[PDB]
Structures are given as structure tokens and as C-alpha cells.
Design an enzyme around this catalytic site. Sequence first.
Site, PDB file in Angstrom:
ATOM      1  CD  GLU A  12      -2.139  -0.369   3.384  1.00 24.11           C
ATOM      2  OE1 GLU A  12      -2.439  -1.569   3.628  1.00 24.11           O
ATOM      3  OE2 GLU A  12      -2.709   0.600   3.984  1.00 24.11           O
ATOM      4  CG  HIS A  39      -3.631  -6.768   7.411  1.00 22.42           C
ATOM      5  ND1 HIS A  39      -2.881  -6.713   6.236  1.00 22.42           N
ATOM      6  CD2 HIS A  39      -4.290  -5.604   7.570  1.00 22.42           C
ATOM      7  CE1 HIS A  39      -3.131  -5.496   5.754  1.00 22.42           C
ATOM      8  NE2 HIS A  39      -3.945  -4.784   6.523  1.00 22.42           N
ATOM      9  CG  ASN A  61      -5.043  -4.272   2.005  1.00 22.20           C
ATOM     10  OD1 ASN A  61      -4.556  -4.284   0.891  1.00 22.20           O
ATOM     11  ND2 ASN A  61      -4.730  -3.395   2.945  1.00 22.20           N
TER      12      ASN A  61
HETATM   13  C1  FAD Z   1      -5.304   0.188  11.339  1.00 23.18           C
HETATM   14  C2  FAD Z   1      -5.928  -0.944  10.500  1.00 23.18           C
HETATM   15  C3  FAD Z   1      -5.964  -0.836   9.145  1.00 23.18           C
HETATM   16  C4  FAD Z   1      -6.508  -1.842   8.337  1.00 23.18           C
HETATM   17  N1  FAD Z   1      -6.693  -1.592   7.005  1.00 23.18           N
HETATM   18  C5  FAD Z   1      -7.292  -2.628   6.256  1.00 23.18           C
HETATM   19  C6  FAD Z   1      -7.730  -2.350   4.953  1.00 23.18           C
HETATM   20  O1  FAD Z   1      -7.634  -1.246   4.376  1.00 23.18           O
HETATM   21  N2  FAD Z   1      -8.280  -3.441   4.265  1.00 23.18           N
HETATM   22  C7  FAD Z   1      -8.373  -4.718   4.794  1.00 23.18           C
HETATM   23  O2  FAD Z   1      -8.744  -5.642   4.038  1.00 23.18           O
HETATM   24  N3  FAD Z   1      -8.099  -4.925   6.092  1.00 23.18           N
HETATM   25  C8  FAD Z   1      -7.628  -3.877   6.801  1.00 23.18           C
HETATM   26  N4  FAD Z   1      -7.437  -4.091   8.131  1.00 23.18           N
HETATM   27  C9  FAD Z   1      -7.700  -5.424   8.718  1.00 23.18           C
HETATM   28  C10 FAD Z   1      -9.201  -5.676   8.900  1.00 23.18           C
HETATM   29  O3  FAD Z   1      -9.797  -4.579   9.556  1.00 23.18           O
HETATM   30  C11 FAD Z   1      -9.362  -6.998   9.694  1.00 23.18           C
HETATM   31  O4  FAD Z   1      -8.679  -8.010   8.937  1.00 23.18           O
HETATM   32  C12 FAD Z   1     -10.806  -7.383   9.885  1.00 23.18           C
HETATM   33  O5  FAD Z   1     -11.483  -6.344  10.581  1.00 23.18           O
HETATM   34  C13 FAD Z   1     -10.892  -8.701  10.673  1.00 23.18           C
HETATM   35  O6  FAD Z   1     -12.295  -9.085  10.715  1.00 23.18           O
HETATM   36  P1  FAD Z   1     -12.777 -10.140  11.796  1.00 23.18           P
HETATM   37  O7  FAD Z   1     -14.204 -10.387  11.532  1.00 23.18           O
HETATM   38  O8  FAD Z   1     -11.824 -11.299  11.871  1.00 23.18           O
HETATM   39  O9  FAD Z   1     -12.592  -9.380  13.219  1.00 23.18           O
HETATM   40  P2  FAD Z   1     -12.739  -7.890  13.735  1.00 23.18           P
HETATM   41  O10 FAD Z   1     -13.132  -6.979  12.629  1.00 23.18           O
HETATM   42  O11 FAD Z   1     -11.486  -7.568  14.493  1.00 23.18           O
HETATM   43  O12 FAD Z   1     -13.990  -7.934  14.717  1.00 23.18           O
HETATM   44  C14 FAD Z   1     -13.999  -8.679  15.988  1.00 23.18           C
HETATM   45  C15 FAD Z   1     -15.034  -8.017  16.843  1.00 23.18           C
HETATM   46  O13 FAD Z   1     -15.259  -8.882  17.974  1.00 23.18           O
HETATM   47  C16 FAD Z   1     -15.278  -8.094  19.164  1.00 23.18           C
HETATM   48  N5  FAD Z   1     -14.868  -8.963  20.269  1.00 23.18           N
HETATM   49  C17 FAD Z   1     -13.647  -9.510  20.434  1.00 23.18           C
HETATM   50  N6  FAD Z   1     -13.614 -10.383  21.495  1.00 23.18           N
HETATM   51  C18 FAD Z   1     -14.928 -10.359  21.979  1.00 23.18           C
HETATM   52  C19 FAD Z   1     -15.547 -11.029  23.034  1.00 23.18           C
HETATM   53  N7  FAD Z   1     -14.886 -11.928  23.799  1.00 23.18           N
HETATM   54  N8  FAD Z   1     -16.839 -10.764  23.303  1.00 23.18           N
HETATM   55  C20 FAD Z   1     -17.484  -9.851  22.524  1.00 23.18           C
HETATM   56  N9  FAD Z   1     -16.995  -9.179  21.473  1.00 23.18           N
HETATM   57  C21 FAD Z   1     -15.719  -9.463  21.225  1.00 23.18           C
HETATM   58  C22 FAD Z   1     -14.342  -6.927  18.874  1.00 23.18           C
HETATM   59  O14 FAD Z   1     -14.466  -5.877  19.789  1.00 23.18           O
HETATM   60  C23 FAD Z   1     -14.648  -6.624  17.398  1.00 23.18           C
HETATM   61  O15 FAD Z   1     -15.673  -5.639  17.245  1.00 23.18           O
HETATM   62  C24 FAD Z   1      -6.976  -3.032   8.983  1.00 23.18           C
HETATM   63  C25 FAD Z   1      -7.007  -3.076  10.355  1.00 23.18           C
HETATM   64  C26 FAD Z   1      -6.479  -2.059  11.134  1.00 23.18           C
HETATM   65  C27 FAD Z   1      -6.444  -2.245  12.626  1.00 23.18           C
END
Ligand code: FAD
Length: 501
Positions: free
Chosen positions: A354, A440, A478
Site C-alpha cells: 500500500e 491484519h 488486505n
Molecule cells: C489500522 C488498521 C488498518 C486496516 N486496514 C485494512 C484495509 O484497508 N483493508 C483490509 O482488508 N483490512 C484492513 N485491516 C484489517 C481488517 O480490519 C481486519 O482483517 C478485519 O477487521 C478482521 O475481521 P474479523 O471479523 O476477523 O474481526 P474484527 O473486525 O477484528 O472484529 C472482531 C469483533 O469482535 C469483538 N470482540 C472480540 N472479542 C470479543 C468477546 N470476547 N466478546 C465480545 N466481542 C468481542 C471486537 O471488539 C470486534 O468488534 C486493517 C485493520 C487495522 C487495525
Amino acid sequence: GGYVPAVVIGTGYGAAVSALRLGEAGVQTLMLEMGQLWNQPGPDGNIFCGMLNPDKRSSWFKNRTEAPLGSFLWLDVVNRNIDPYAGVLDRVNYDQMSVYVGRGVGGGSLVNGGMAVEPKRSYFEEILPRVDSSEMYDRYFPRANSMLRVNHIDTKWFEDTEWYKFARVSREQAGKAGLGTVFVPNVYDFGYMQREAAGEVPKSALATEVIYGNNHGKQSLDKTYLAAALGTGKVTIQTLHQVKTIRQTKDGGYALTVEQKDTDGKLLATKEISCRYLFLGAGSLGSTELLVRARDTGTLPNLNSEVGAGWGPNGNIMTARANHMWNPTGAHQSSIPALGIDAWDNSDSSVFAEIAPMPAGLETWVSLYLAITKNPQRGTFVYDAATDRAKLNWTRDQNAPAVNAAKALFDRINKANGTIYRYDLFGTQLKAFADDFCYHPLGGCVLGKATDDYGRVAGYKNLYVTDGSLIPGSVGVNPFVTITALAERNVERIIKQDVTA
Ligand SMILES: Cc1cc2nc3c(=O)[nH]c(=O)nc-3n(C[C@H](O)[C@H](O)[C@H](O)COP(=O)(O)OP(=O)(O)OC[C@H]3O[C@@H](n4cnc5c(N)ncnc54)[C@H](O)[C@@H]3O)c2cc1C
């Protein structure tokens, strides 16, 4: 507390997809999110803080704000002491790795850069050989693309606007090294961004907002999948509810202990919530911690030895090049990347980078990059019964292959342009490559390892993992589009084969 047919833990990508399709299938579903619903205007009138005005909303239970990685030399001056609060961005510190995750309704979609990228099919087939790739590319990637509201920048407007000068400078520098660039689709509405630059709507991407949320423009999951899930009439979301334990009772299904806290972190209640179908969407970190804890504290003792294993940081490495004086990157940089360098061919030298904006708001001459690399090293989450935490055992030397690949690419750019790296952006000791962070996180409950090929947890019935913990450490791009499309695939099959309305 009480019984609900389906419970979904978390409200990120895996969780949101699962809840929408459950609700459309007529299954009453409760989502439990440990963070807030981000819809209350704060003291500045905005939901979220910007990067130049961080406050307690920026951080999950920290006592001081932090500068976004790369920007300390310019943004430390705005840092302030804060009350520990249920803010939107959590830097989770392990021994030799800091993992950043979103906290709130929408998970990482609240804080991420919006970049919506489908992996290379030949790489998908390498990382997940047990999955039918034709159904992913024919059905589930398109479904994700549409539901996420992916859109594409106007390339003519891109060319002309001051807000993307930084991207154009790196494109021309890369081009001297014989490297082209690609436009990166996004869930930030690029039509909104044109209205921002014209002065017609409030600025968000064009006012140094992204990593603590976007007040406008970004179609986070609360606007897309989760809004649709609520619209089914069969889904509810309870916030500031953290699932702590998972067990079996005489009722059948699963029983959860769930802590309800206020935004100051005070414990208000511990609830007993139970269900027939349990879906984990707590992220790579959160889902893996729940299952490692359940195995090692004996509440789900038949979980297998692959629970906790196979974690990687998507090869994430950050670096920066110092431009010559005559190649400024501009004081005005959109917070949403639009360009990348695709040097990914599935070999060990692969890099997808990126071209990242610098949020300083004044000229720095820096070009910043977030590289995604192919590094086979993996970590494991190991239960610490003393503190009741999963601890990631990753060591910084495990990122050496990632550093090496990133450096080979950017060395070629430096050589063609007569530039050098910055060494001062990531702390006082000279360091050109940040190698101990992750945006990520991928793995911990790997598809086909800890689970079957649809995320059914091995050893248990009606227990599902839906999120980035399924992915084997790397996707080459990403990751949220992959997480979403895999979740679409998994929940469709699970509903068909396992579930009753
Ligand atoms: C700064 C940053 C930049 C990024 N930029 C990109 C991008 O441009 N494009 C891209 O593809 N990816 C990007 N990512 C990565 C992407 O955001 C993640 O890969 C994605 O959000 C992961 O999805 P997920 O469903 O695994 O979990 P998450 O989106 O992390 O969601 C997990 C959720 O579960 C909740 N949770 C956790 N434990 C518990 C519990 N025990 N009880 C209740 N709730 C709980 C959390 O609070 C959260 O809301 C970025 C991430 C960050 C931090």
C-alpha cells in the site's frame, strides 16, 4: 440473560455476514459486542476523533493517546493523557508483537483503511487447497463485493487532485524502477470524497480521519451487513458485552458467561446467555483466545491441538523512503489509500504494498508504505492460567523473511531514484522497517485444522468460527474481502446442512 437460538460473538466481518444470513433464514440471533455502538456525538459534535485531535475515543483502555505508526515525529505534539475508556482502536501488546484491532459495532471496519482487495486465485489455491476455488471466485467473492459496497476511484479525478499527490509521487518513483501501480478498490465512497474536496460535505478522509473512525464517507459494517441484519427483524446487538467463557449444560447447545461493563470499564453485571448455535466472530485474537481458554480451563475439553496454532501477521511490514526536496508528497493527503504496488507472484520475494498517506498535515517529503509479504513463520497462542489470557508466542526474529522481502523491493526503488530510507520514524533507535506490529492478524483457529472446511470447530456440534482466525496466516492482500467471502461460503453451507429456522 437467557436463551436465544443463535448467538454471534463479535460484530466484525465474519460475525456480520453470519448474522445477516441467519436472520434472513429466520433464525433469531443475538450478537454480543464488547465495544460500543458508535452513534453518539461526542464533545466536538463528532462520533469519532481525528488523527490530529486524538482523545479517549481513540483508544481502548489506555492512559495516553498514541501517534499512528510512521507519524510520531509529527503527531506526538498532539498526544495527550486520557482516561481509560471504551475507545475504538485497541493496540494489543504481546511479548514481541503489537496487534491493532477495532472495538465496537463493526469491529475492524470502523478503523481500517477500507481497502477491498480480492486475493490472487493461484495464491488462494496455495493457502487453502481443500477449498473449492471455483465457488469462491464464481459466487462468494462477487457476493462480498456487492454487499460491502466496494467502489472505485475516478481515475481522472485521482490524477488531478492535490489529495493524491503523495500517491502520484510514489507511482512515478516506482515507475523508474520498472514497477507499475494498481488502483485499490475501497468501501470509502469515492463520490463522497470528490464532494469533500469540493467543499460541499464535511471532510473525513480529507481531514486526517481513518484509524480512529471516519465520521463520514466510509461504509463500515454498521452501514452495510449489520444494518441489513437488523433489517431482517431477527437480529439484535448488545454492546459493552464481552463473552468470557463457553461451556455445555443440560440444556443442550452452549452457555456463555458474559460481562456487561460501562464505558469506564466498570463491571455492571455478569450474565448467563445460552443458545443452540454458537458462532465466534471475535477476530483472530478474540475467537482464538476464547477457544484456547475453553480447552485449557476444561470447559470444552475436546478441542484439538490446532486451536491456537498457525497465526501470522499477513507478512505486515511498514517502511518509509525520504524523497528529495524537489519531490514533495504534499501537505494534503487523503487518509484513504488509492494506489498500491503489486509485486506479488507467489514466490518468497512477493510483496503487495500500500502507498500509505502521512497524516501530518504539512510537508514531510516522506513516502510511507505498508507491505504484505509471504513469510512462512507462524506463532501460537498459549494459555496463561495465571492471568487468564491467551499469549501469542511470536518472536521478532520470525519477521526476518518479511523484512527481507520488503527491503528487496524498496531497495530497487531507492536505487532507481537515488533516495534512502528514513530510519527515524519508528522510535529513537535507527530502524527502517517496523517489524513488530500487525494490522491484519490471521489464524489461530485455521480452516481445516482447528475446524472442518466450513469453520465447524472440530470435536463439537453447532459450534462455528467465522472470522480471520480461520485464515492460515497470509492472504497476500488486505484481508477483509477474503474474510467476508469465506464467511459467506461458510454460513450458506452451515445454514443449509445444520440449521433449523
Ligand atoms: C489500522 C488498521 C488498518 C486496516 N486496514 C485494512 C484495509 O484497508 N483493508 C483490509 O482488508 N483490512 C484492513 N485491516 C484489517 C481488517 O480490519 C481486519 O482483517 C478485519 O477487521 C478482521 O475481521 P474479523 O471479523 O476477523 O474481526 P474484527 O473486525 O477484528 O472484529 C472482531 C469483533 O469482535 C469483538 N470482540 C472480540 N472479542 C470479543 C468477546 N470476547 N466478546 C465480545 N466481542 C468481542 C471486537 O471488539 C470486534 O468488534 C486493517 C485493520 C487495522 C487495525
